[model samples]
Target: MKLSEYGLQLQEKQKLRHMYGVNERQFRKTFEEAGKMPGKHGENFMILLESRLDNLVYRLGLARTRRQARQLVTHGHILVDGSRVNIPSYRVKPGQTIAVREKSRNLQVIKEALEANNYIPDYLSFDPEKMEGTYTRLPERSELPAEINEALIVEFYSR
Candidate 1:
């Protein structure tokens, strides 16, 4: 089956979740909720899908990828305005500044992700020296350049 289908075995399910940096339960829940909404469900759903907290973390330069950011957030390396926020799904609001902890600033993996800083999406403004970045606003659908058809995910769940 396609990614939009459920016939995949446990391994595929696990892979999909891991690939997207979300646990199975929360991923399923998000899909279910997206399925119930009106309009071109998949595309709309993906817009929300790509706007996740960990994705924002990656977009802000805290980690190399969404998965890396999720790990950093869970391992207590990510902070927001000086407070720890470990949950990867914790949607960030405007004016929030996501930063790498003083302790994690020099991690090799993080440093490479920085030296190879081409992954930063256009929706944010980052300040590397300060080790902080601002979420100027909620990202629009056009902002997510990845090839995901959120509406199909929404349609799949809606049934």
Candidate 2:
């Protein structure tokens, strides 16, 4: 239930940590606690993480990658339900929509990302004209995009 459990070295951890805007200890602790929560530990742990605003921003292709999404969020380019939330850790729920702030909608980076890619994931729906999208629900594990082996995290915490 720690980043170490993924056998990810400091470099990789740093990559994801910075990409996700988390300190090393905090990130590990998040996995530790989430891994111990009730229900399918692995599944629920990932559920909590993938629900983060930055992750959704990446999933929706509002940004080229989650790292870019985190940066955009910190820079005030992201909005949720009409509010600007700069924190990348904002946990969004099913039905909550994510949108590129109207002012940010035309950023060259965002525009290029949009033009280069137009495929939407099955779990989300949006109106490209309005530059808005909604996360329909907590997607099933199979719908996850990150290459995570949740079971290892669960076992790491169990020990």
Best by TM-score: 2
Give the per-residue Cα lDDT of candidate 2 at 141: 73
lDDT of 2 at 78: 75
Residue-by-residue lDDT tens digits, candidate 1, 24-96: 6677776666656574555544555565767766766667776687788888887786777887766566667
RMSD per model, one decimal:
4.5, 4.7
lDDT, candidate 2, at 115? 62
Question: Would you list the C-alpha lDDT of every candidate in the order shown?
Answer: 0.66, 0.69
| Each prediction's TM-score versus the true structure | 0.70, 0.75
Give Cα distance to truth, residue 107, candidate 1, Å.
2.3
Give each model's clash number. 8, 0
